[PDB]
Design a protein around this nucleic acid. Structure first.
Ligand code: AR6
Ligand code: AR6
Lengths: 101, 50, 116, 473, 51, 51, 51
DNA sequence: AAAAAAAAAAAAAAAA
RNA sequence: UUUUUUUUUUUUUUUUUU
């Protein structure tokens, strides 16, 4: 079943907010997946991202900032999220988050 | 049988040339795209292919 | 029902299939005896099937998978069974006169080949 | 020990002056010789069968694969191989109802039932050709399977299905292509079996014509014939010398008129000013009386050869320098005397006899395969054996099934060098436009002439028939 | 050879025959298909092959 | 005696389209009269001929 | 100067289409690199591909 | 009214 | 008749001799 919340984000900059949010949500009993805290090292990271988004990601969260708007990786995983949204018939699958004033 | 929803993560942003129903049409698309992007080209010689 | 090391009489279901030869000599290129291979069928191993259509169907159903390596050996085995000695046989045409034919067919030679 | 020599495997030219021994591989990669912008296709047949034709045309549109690509090359799709547009849009459709086709089929007499069944298509197609604005380059006739069961000689309709002209043959195909000759229209017969057979099943459940592995070859055979019937050049022969025409004479039996009358037919093969080969028919059918003569009386033989030299002199300018007449039956000297007189002095006249009846079966000592195709056993400067049926390595299997029978090639008349004769027969075994195979059993002249003879002996009222094979194959 | 004739009917028949024979031969004894047959005709024939 | 009429009448058995053109209706600019202007001048109306 | 066109594919599954496209592109005058094109294989090519 | 050596017409299936 | 090939039935002619 799908019981994971994926937090896409710009890794070079937004690690702090994403780590805080992931810790808060894990404390709140919600299973959470993110590259900084739950990605398995020494593994095919793109393949794992595809597997988790397509298969187990029940909800998608995007951290949108001045960096994340033009980052390539967030764009790719965002497109995969859109595709799995079309597959699942869930308009509330994705909730972008506005961070930058 | 390969729906566009199941494509790998590194292609979904890229435009996919369609060869599914007409190979010649897709090949013409490839030739036009290569001409537009000015891919280096040699004078056509099918004898090399032979 | 097997001469030398290759079979000649066998079965498929209730039909016995039997190897046969048809021979005739030609003298134009060389004095030679051509032999053609055939497969016939019997219901009990002794009485042949009288229906031409049935026999044709059966022989084609056979000839599906026997290629050269098992047509040639059966033909040579039948010829060797017809042999009178190790190197030839003789047609009995007279009480004192006999026609000696070789039991070994004529060989040809080709300069080209290939591999499987 | 007797020496047998191998003659080189012939090559056939493709687009841009390129050569390829195989036809399927050459077309699948290099395309046809000429550009034929589009094929406007017409379909005549029942509405139910039209669904199958449209489905199979779409099936051909997508490239298809054979089980073993080495044995038979894959099919990259009509639009790719032939670079010509052939779509399911633009098909001019004529419908025949099941009731109308069933009124005629369930007849006691085979001759009249076949005559009226074929007229049912001929009248409609004539009306389409002469009354409708749209142009139809080639006309496909999809025919049901019950018709094929009961539209052929000695095919007896079951007594439970009997519900209810003799100057015509009981064969659907022969009569059908026979009666349309005056209209100059290209036609192609398709059986509803030959199409997407998977619907049709036997008692075991397997399709009767199960080609689950061999879709690619069937598509290749359909597409090349369709392109040729439209007026395109699939491939051309490149080793033909200058000043050579061939002609192939074949004798067929005619039953309508008393005495078999053994009508003879001919086909031509020669080079033309430039490089474009000319492969047409030379049909002036010369009726030959007597039951089993198979030899031309001097007058008609002279007419045949004069016509043949004409359609060369008006097409190149000067007379042929070397002619290779081929036939299944040996020539008597009476024909040769007539032939010699008509010919000018400069030409060298050669009459070559080709036969299969000789029972030679060369087995090899070891190996589960057959003799290489291209070998030649030269008996003497006048006669030889050439295995045009046998193993070739490109198609990975022998064209024949058991150990094949070579062809007895003998220069019955004229002199000829044996090597050149055995070099051109193997070349001629390539240009089969009715079927797209690597090579055929024996040269195309004797088989296209055989086809035109079997078709021209189906209608009595044939007068000056067309000389183009597009109306025949 | 045809046009410079005394009879207009015979010259017209000869001119029509000359074209129609070649057109029929192309239709029936040639491989390449022709959708439309354009007949380019000079002006002397136009002026001297009419009633 | 009408070349066009007889021509189109005799080709009917073969069911083959055709179009008769005069050389003047074609690129007339070669055809010049005594004055020096083309007899069938279509300089201003060539588009309609194409249509 | 980069002028080669790389054709990545599944070699034992997509061999035929890659053959067709590469053999047509080479004839068209476009340099093409593929694993099926080169005959014989060695320990080196794994690195070669990358470079 | 036979001999063998030469003919073509049609059907039936298999696999290409 | 998408084709190809291999068979099996017939039948048929020609050449000779009574
Ligand atoms: N072997 C490696 N190769 C590439 N990048 C690596 C590697 N190891 C660590 N990284 C780090 O991987 C990061 C590549 O990120 P980027 O493409 O630059 O910018 P984004 O904002 O679009 O990345 C956002 C997503 O891509 C991420 O992979 C995550 O999956 C994100 O979800 C670099 O910081 C590298 O230091
Ligand atoms: N790799 C690919 N990924 C997605 N679409 C592709 C791809 N390659 C080709 N296409 C084609 O790009 C075409 C559309 O891409 P666009 O023109 O930019 O956006 P629109 O607003 O005009 O069309 C809305 C459709 O896009 C949605 O996917 C839905 O399918 C919509 O129907 C697709 O039809 C694909 O066939």
């Amino acid at each position: 079943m799908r019981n994971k919340i994926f937090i896409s984000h710009a890794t070079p900059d937004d690690n702090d907010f994403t780590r805080w949010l992931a810790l808060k949500l894990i404390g709140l009993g919600y299973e959470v997946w993110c590259d900084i805290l739950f990605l398995d090292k020494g593994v095919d990271f793109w393949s794992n991202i595809e597997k988790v988004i397509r298969e187990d990601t029940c909800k998608f969260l995007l951290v949108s900032s001045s960096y994340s708007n033009q980052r390539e990786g967030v764009l790719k995983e965002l497109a995969v999220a859109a595709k799995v949204k079309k597959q699942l018939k869930d308009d509330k699958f994705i909730i972008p988050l506005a961070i930058d004033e | 049988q390969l729906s566009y929803d199941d494509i790998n993560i590194d292609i979904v942003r890229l435009n996919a040339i369609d060869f599914k129903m007409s190979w010649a049409r897709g090949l013409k698309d490839i030739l036009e795209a290569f001409e537009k992007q000015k891919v280096p080209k040699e004078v056509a010689d099918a004898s090399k292919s032979n | 029902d097997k001469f030398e090391k290759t079979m000649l009489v066998g079965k498929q279901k209730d039909k016995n299939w039997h190897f046969a030869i048809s021979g005739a000599s030609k003298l134009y290129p060389f004095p030679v005896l051509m032999i053609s291979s055939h497969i016939f069928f019997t219901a009990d191993g002794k009485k042949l099937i009288d229906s031409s259509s049935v026999q044709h169907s059966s022989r084609r159903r056979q000839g599906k998978n026997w290629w050269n390596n098992t047509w040639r050996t059966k033909l040579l085995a039948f010829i060797k069974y017809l042999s009178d000695d190790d190197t030839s046989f003789y047609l009995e045409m007279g009480s004192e006169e006999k026609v000696f034919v070789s039991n070994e067919p004529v060989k040809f030679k080709g300069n080209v080949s290939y591999n499987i | 020990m007797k020496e047998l020599i191998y003659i080189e495997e012939p090559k056939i030219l493709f687009a841009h002056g390129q050569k390829c021994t195989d036809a399927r591989d050459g077309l699948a990669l290099f395309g046809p010789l000429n550009n034929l912008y589009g094929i406007k296709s017409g379909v005549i047949g029942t509405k139910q069968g039209l669904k199958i034709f449209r489905d199979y045309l779409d099936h051909i549109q997508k490239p298809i694969y054979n089980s073993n690509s080495i044995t038979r090359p894959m099919f990259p799709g009509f639009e790719a191989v032939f670079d010509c547009k052939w779509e399911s849009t633009g098909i001019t459709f004529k419908e025949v109802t099941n009731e109308d086709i069933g009124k005629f089929l369930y007849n006691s007499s085979t001759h009249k039932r076949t005559y009226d069944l074929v007229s049912l298509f001929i009248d409609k197609i004539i009306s389409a050709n002469k009354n409708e604005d749209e142009n139809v380059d080639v006309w496909f006739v999809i025919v049901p399977d019950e018709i094929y069961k009961y539209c052929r000689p000695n095919s007896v309709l079951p007594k439970e299905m009997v519900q209810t002209t003799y100057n015509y043959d009981a064969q659907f195909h022969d009569q059908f292509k026979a009666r349309l000759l005056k209209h100059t229209i290209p036609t192609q017969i398709f059986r509803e079996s030959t199409l997407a057979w998977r619907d049709f099943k036997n008692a075991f459940g397997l399709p009767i014509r199960d080609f689950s592995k061999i879709e690619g070859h069937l598509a290749w055979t359909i597409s090349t014939a369709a392109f040729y019937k439209a007026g395109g050049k699939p491939w051309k022969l490149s080793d033909v010398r200058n000043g050579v025409c061939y002609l192939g004479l074949v004798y067929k039996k005619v039953e309508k008129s008393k005495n078999p009358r053994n009508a003879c037919c001919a086909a031509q093969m020669f080079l033309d000013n430039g490089d474009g080969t000319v492969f047409k028919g030379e049909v002036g059918p010369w009726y030959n009386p007597k039951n089993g003569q198979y030899h031309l009386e001097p007058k008609e033989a002279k007419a045949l050869l004069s016509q043949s030299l004409q359609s060369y002199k008006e097409q190149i300018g000067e007379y042929p320098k070397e002619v290779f007449i081929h036939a299944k039956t040996r020539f008597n000297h009476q024909e040769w005397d007539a032939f010699l007189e008509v010919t000018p002095k400069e030409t060298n006249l050669v009459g070559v006899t080709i036969s299969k009846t000789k029972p030679l079966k060369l087995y090899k000592t070891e190996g589960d395969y057959t003799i290489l195709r291209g070998n030649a056993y030269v008996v003497n400067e006048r006669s030889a054996f050439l295995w045009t049926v046998g193993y070739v390595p490109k198609i990975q299997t022998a064209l024949s099934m058991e150990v094949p029978n070579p062809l007895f090639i003998e220069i019955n008349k004229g002199e000829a060098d044996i090597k050149q004769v055995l070099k051109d027969i193997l070349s001629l075994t390539k240009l089969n436009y009715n079927a797209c195979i690597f090579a055929d059993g024996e040269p195309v002249t004797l088989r296209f002439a055989d086809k035109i003879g079997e078709i021209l002996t189906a209608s009595t009222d044939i007068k000056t028939p067309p000389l183009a094979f597009k109306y025949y194959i």
